[PDB]
Design a protein around this nucleic acid. Structure first.
Ligand SMILES: [K+]
Ligand SMILES: [K+]
Ligand SMILES: [K+]
Length: 49
RNA sequence: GUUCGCGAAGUAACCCUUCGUGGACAUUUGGUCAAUUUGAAACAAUACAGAGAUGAUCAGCAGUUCCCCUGCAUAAGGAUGAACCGUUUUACAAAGAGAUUU
């Protein structure tokens, strides 16, 4: 059963380290983007452009 | 300033001496640039993380780029120097059938 689980995991992978890091980096860049807009919106609502 | 010529004063008169006066000689430097904050050097420092093809550890050599750095360099080195990894819709037609409408 563990052999099958490990086989399914290794059979799934298709991208190397650089592409995988680019995926996580794009997700982090998006979360940073939304945090930036949240702070900017709070400031704007307070009349601070 | 010098020198050539002329007026004059001084001297008995020259030499010489002074005041005046004409000519000759010599003739336009330098800045793309002002002297600390506001016309632009960078490293470093603090933190986190710890290198592609892999199950794992790695040698690499390239290509593309409106990224270059070190080097005298057309050599070599810089993680295979780095970035590369995402997003993807129409030259759109033909034949036929069963339902919709006057
Ligand atoms: K490492
Ligand atoms: K390598
Ligand atoms: K190399």
């Amino acid at each position: 059963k563990e052999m099958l689980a490990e086989a399914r995991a290794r059979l799934l992978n298709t991208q190397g380290k650089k592409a995988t890091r680019k995926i996580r980096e794009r997700m982090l860049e998006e979360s940073k983007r939304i945090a930036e807009l949240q702070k900017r919106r709070e400031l704007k609502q307070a009349g601070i452009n």
